[model samples]
Target: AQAEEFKKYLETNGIKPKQFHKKELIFNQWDPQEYCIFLYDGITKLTSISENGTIMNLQYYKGAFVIMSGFIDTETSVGYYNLEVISEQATAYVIKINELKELLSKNLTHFFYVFQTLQKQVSYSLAKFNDFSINGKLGSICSQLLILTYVYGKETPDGIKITLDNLTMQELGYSSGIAHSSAVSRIISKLKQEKVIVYKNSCFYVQNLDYLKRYAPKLDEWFYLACPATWGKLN
Candidate 1:
């Protein structure tokens, strides 16, 4: 695959590897960035922070190049977006932006493939942006549950159990665009009352997935699902 070839190419060249722990921003969004990152393995969340400082969780990324720099040579580069590690830890390959861009320009085929991946990320995030506005808080929360069902779900005899031990109630709300502490609990209670979902041992089990689908009318819309080994070089 083009991604693998690019990874190997980085291995042979600018092989500055970096490791990141959970809850850490991969790079400071406010600072001018000189390093370009290629994710080797790990889970990361992309978030958009408003001028007023409210953070909106945008999209999640696994084993892909974390490209945020606009490739234009006209200005000093800075990221308007933030990337955070959501998993326990993450490993990445690092190279200077100028160096990486120089390498990219040399291979015309490689240049296009990399941008193709970037465009997919942009489109995916934009779709989610449009979704939160139209779907309202409840539907957006439902969409979050579906994302969890795919990312951390384990099928038991009962149903699909979504484990959230690593995530706190605050994050569940924060990522869903809900800021208040008890707001997420209220939503959970509503689902609990309907017997659609139940929480135990810090996890939610989906008893009636159709209810979630029905609750979120655009259930068939873009849901950030499992980017399992299909997304990375290693399983």
Candidate 2:
């Protein structure tokens, strides 16, 4: 992984990792960003809260070089996301823009990595908006679960289980821009009734792909395209 390579390079340049405990607030949205780079190493979730106290789960990232979301906006002084460490503990090397520039001034590895991550963030935002706008609420929700499956999914004997953070129906709804919490619960309940998906012992499992396909017709298209972490499969 480039992460290992990055660690070596950063160490040689006098940078070391910092540890973050579970549920640690990495940074709040709109806070004055002190560091430009969190050479990410951990389960990080970026979330945004609307004016009405509704939190939108931007997405989850595992082991990547992520810049403060503030960099994407016009004001680079403030961050645009609430980045949190979800897993037990995280080890990341926080670096300033000055150091990052020097690292970039040196190698194609650093240069490409920096630019690549920025592009990745932009694309993710675009796709999330497109999905919700075009698919409507239910379809967006279905595709979101499928995308989550692609990310945190573990294949079990019974079905594909989502093994990750507290994916409460509230959080799931937030991720898809559904503000009314009860609507999300209802949607999840319907899925459970159809034997399509379930939650137990703090995880959600997808039991039937067919049911989701029928509900959200673009299920395959979205899953295959949106999952950057996994090698794709066609069925």
Candidate 3:
């Protein structure tokens, strides 16, 4: 509903939506065109490539408005970044940087809304950073699980069913800052043994949300509360 409302907001502001497919590059680093986007559906990820060619995921959003500080600049390319569609079908509405600047200059209300959006994104990242500081790897895993459950889970008579076909154990480990697969597997196995969740046919059924919430520290709740505009719709 929030994504729909955002779309309507864009339409009201005279920007049209654009369609994109899986694996498409929305914007490349140093491409020279500056724009911000309203992602309507599916997931997108921003990645930074290091000088040694190592890749790191800067951020990933299922659907929401996204704007980064260096997103609209033509400066040094020491750290290259790219925004790419990570879902099968992704949709977005783009507003050129100059046009957005013009709108903000003309309307104080628009400027305020834009500022609020950017601030929220910064707050979300800060919450994640704090999660790392408080609970370390445990907090990261808990936060990622909660996010996966919200974004990809389907409510069922049994529980919230989450398909894991597209999500590898390695990816899960990386999200939790656990670089070792065996270590992550041990943690997951422990959860299964405790009956907090069950996995079958490449899917997870969270049998007990309350238990899951307690498995980690307070970071799960922190992330849940921080991104209501995108994550609030989950059951």
Scored by lDDT, the top model is 2
Q: Count of backbone clashes for each model? A: 0, 0, 0
Question: 1 or 3: which has the higher lDDT?
Answer: 1
The runs of at least 3 residues in candidate 3 whose Cα sits more than 4 Å from the true structure, single-residue gaps closed, are 1-15, 30-32, 69-79, 163-165, 215-220, 223-235
In candidate 3, list every pair of residues with a backbone clash: none
Per-residue lDDT for 209-231 in model 2, tens only? Answer: 66655555444554556543462
Cα lDDT tens digits for candidate 3, 107-160: 666566667777767676776676556666665666667657755777778777
Candidate 2 residue-pair clash tally: 0
Give the per-residue lDDT digits (tens) of candidate 1, residues 54-151. 87776667766566544546435655777788788888876667676777888767678777777766666665555556758887777777656655
Estimate candidate 3's alpha-carbon lDDT, on a 0 to 1 scale: 0.67
Q: At residue 177, what lDDT does model 1 achieve?
A: 72
Better of 2 and 3 by TM-score: 2
lDDT of 2 at 102: 61
Name the lDDT of candidate 1. 0.69
CA lDDT of 75 in candidate 3?
Answer: 26
Two-way lDDT contest, 2 vs 3, winner: 2
TM-score of each: 0.79, 0.84, 0.77
Off by over 4 Å in 2: 70-75, 210-229, 233-235
User: How does candidate 3 fare on TM-score?
Assistant: 0.77
Query: Which RMSD values do the candidates have, in order?
Result: 4.2, 3.0, 3.7
